[model samples]
Target chain A: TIAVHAGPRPYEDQAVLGAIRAAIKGLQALSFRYEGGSTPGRTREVTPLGVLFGRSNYLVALEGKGGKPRSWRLDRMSDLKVLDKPAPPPQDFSLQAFADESFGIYHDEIQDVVLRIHKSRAEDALRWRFHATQQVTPEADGSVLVTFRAGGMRELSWHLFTWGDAVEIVAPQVLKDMMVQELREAGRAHGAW
Target chain B: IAVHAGPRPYEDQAVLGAIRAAIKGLQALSFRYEGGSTPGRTREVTPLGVLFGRSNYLVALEGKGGKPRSWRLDRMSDLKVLDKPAPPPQDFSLQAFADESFGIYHDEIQDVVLRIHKSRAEDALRWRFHATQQVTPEADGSVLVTFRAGGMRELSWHLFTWGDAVEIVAPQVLKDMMVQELREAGRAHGAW
Candidate 1:
């Protein structure tokens, strides 16, 4: 047997999965308790559009009556109940396109993310998958430069942090600030400098 | 930025230098292999190349040539570069070899097939599962993924991440190997 390294996301509850599937298949509404990253439970009624799985799993749905579609983590949901009400997804909606709007699993203001990969790790950086819209080019200084229009900058920050050295944030001041803020906080925990 | 976690790459500078020098000079290598069926035995092999993915591996030919095999760099110790001239086959393309398999280990070659649930099919399409994966979108928006490759055990472990969103549709052994894990998990938990 091969050694399998399990990731952070848990196996989604079949009950939650069945409910969401029924709602989407039958065009029915759904009610569930949701706990986001920093909060307790809240009962939300939504029209389940589709699901997206990656670093995390989520239900892309239209919250409230004909509200804009949003994503909710499947693991955070509980007591999912499919309703009899007719709740169809927006005809023009594309779950794939919606997800491709950002990097990873979140959708926020899509900004052009740019990073400079020092030449020492250019091959590894070039081989990596950054985003759907990623474009990697060689810099004059022999570094590899990546530019992609994406969101979920905070998640991006978490990623860049682990990469540690051989990475430099070149674009998106918000992302730059977030990385520094995060690094400072991490450093503050032990090495005060 | 890739998420860095658990079982990092082998970072011994001398070991890496030895492997690269052997490959560059068309030489052989002798290293204590600890990851195979037995513990720590010095095995000599013709150095081919190094590749990366979930981890790094030194792809090489078995001593005197049987078949190409991958030895995990993390598992290798007491690495030594040899003076023996052992050039790789002129027709062996490292990239091509890497593309033919679905895992780090060069193992059995088989056809891999999968059914991606409709909800996640579109996302599945974006993944470069293999160099020759044929992703066919079904009538109901689900996906049928097919590719010829080896490394089913490694691929099997990877499928757990996809959760129930995917179903293996080919290679009965792959499906069989996957199910027995839960059988033991359930049995061990008093509910087989």
Candidate 2:
């Protein structure tokens, strides 16, 4: 069941009524989704806060803590209940500038290791948002030093794991010991324990 | 002078259409921003991709590669065209994939298992996006869900957002390390 709050005016004012109508439709399942087809989905009863369009679809939601925002794609969701829950919107965290500034969305602040990958592999590096900011410097060995910031030591560990030594972490005297620890840990996981 | 994508609407019609619109707005401004309702705060275009909201607000987009994702309402700025973009919107490494399955719309390939205390199990239900796998019920009425994501650090931060409710499994190294770190942190920070 969905309930909407129309304050003080009895269903006659055009703008308010129109807004109520849009609100009603927005609260409905189809309004949030595209009309092309139907498929398996889930239902959620939430307070409708605002609607935003992404490069692909629209998201309607309520705000969460720490100013965090909750979003649901229109097309992907069904059986929604948009109620007049007059709660202040969340400020959990801001996203606009975040998406605009970083190379990707995985932000970490743990490990800061540098690696020099061959320039030929530069394109591969660009293929993913592995590092915060990367600079390709010409190296004496016809390679380029890929300098970027990463969060969490596991990130670099995973990157090097995928690259399989195609790159090397240039800085941080501790990572050498850490990587060895990682290998020993991996061996244990592999039952080489 | 920026040359628009000639005459293509699909450039604006993907799963995240409004995001592209927002990006087009950002692109037109050359990624600049000014301050907002706040007394003294401002920023530049930094968010790579946005997790859209059909009803409320856009989820906070964390800045990748060491930068923190800040709010747009706090700041906006002037924009300029860098150059003309060719047909089919240029694929940004960040915006290129939306289906790799986890960590605020990016790619990190790993299985994640989390156990949340019953006190905070409802918190998990409030979420909109998360990797799907197996969600098991615990003896304490807590919930354990197994899933995969792009990176553990970001995922770890997410778990931290749940605070005492979440517990990591499988990656014993990470789990035990964080546990020790938290125990020490509690000692140092918990006392008034």
Candidate 3:
């Protein structure tokens, strides 16, 4: 049997919510909760955009000031209280468009990812269709080029690496070469020889 | 100016360096951490993916059985045992890619509807997501966000931010119940 789990977020306490609301009533919206997963005092003043569950806890709000929308982990919030009430959200805000491009909570730049998968692992690739921004195409020779966009380079590199040798990066020659270098070094570092 | 400290994993005086090295090894191979922000487990297995931090230190790995594996922190016999060094990655695991598209929440999927108020919509878009999610724009300017995931409870913690700006859908029955329970507490506190 397959026992699965969900994702993470920026807040997890009910009292914190009320505290945040009360704080907001005072127009003290400058405060934010620590979001370092387990660190203290780490925070970001948010306009309290809203909350949603994406397999785990998350809060969609501006980190601070007037910047792009960013996701923060709720579980890491030490104290969450509305510091300012009747606060105004950013002028240019579009939740739908933002959600469309984001692969996960950490929505940043979008990169097109192409993967070459052997025939046997085709279904395995299909089972995880979470990369909504991606397109999977079957090669005439029985391989798959899984295409998608990712937010971060580090996280994306990790993703491509997990495919082992079954999936090969085909496009974004830069990323493909990086994967090759990573594998080449790793292969040499751990090869049984 | 904003202030923050370095990563919290460094706080563990006993296991900091070991964890860092393990993470470095995992990164060098391009494999994801199956563990949590702090996942500790035994058995000689490879780290595959990482999930949520704290409370749920999940690690996907090739268990002794070899086909595939996952281990939780609570089940670890000893972090030190799990930290036992292993040969670094030579050839990347071919199938490790499929399990990561969802940021390791590749289990179950579902539809989630969050009614966010206009005021909070700005931040809402920045911080929230459904399991493979979508956000529908409402006429009133609110958003109906949806996503799919197997582990629902892991993500329910975000519901508390409603702070009058949001309301969870019915399938999110527990969230409503939690909100009501808090409301009663507030009333009681007022009498105090």
TM-score of each: 0.47, 0.33, 0.35
Q: What C-alpha lDDT values do all the predictions have?
A: 0.69, 0.40, 0.47
lDDT of 2: 0.40
lDDT over C-alpha atoms for residue B28 of model 1: 84
Q: Tens digit of lDDT per residue, candidate 3, span B1-192? A: 111111111123233343345555653212323444544423455554433332233344553445434444333444442434444345444234333323343454445566777887766665535335566778998877666444343343234323456666635543543444333322322211
Error of 3 at A141 (Å): 68
Docking class of 2: incorrect
Per-residue alpha-carbon lDDT of candidate 3 for residues A81-179, written as tens digits (9 for 90 to 100)? 565345576656565445545325444455676667777767556544535456767778877777776645434553444343466556676665554
Fraction of native contacts under 8 Å reproduced by each candidate: 0.00, 0.00, 0.03
Candidate 1 residue B130 C-alpha distance from true site, Å: 1.3
lDDT of 2 at A32: 31
Please give the lDDT score at residue A46 for candidate 2: 39
The reply for model 3, stretches above 4 Å from the true place, is A1-193, B1-16, B19-42, B49-52, B56-58, B62-107, B170-192
Error of 1 at A75 (Å): 26
Worst 10 residues of 2 chain B by lDDT: B1-10
Tell me the tens digit of each residue's lDDT in model 2 across B84-166. 33122234443223334343324446666777779977645444335254667778888887765554444443343344456
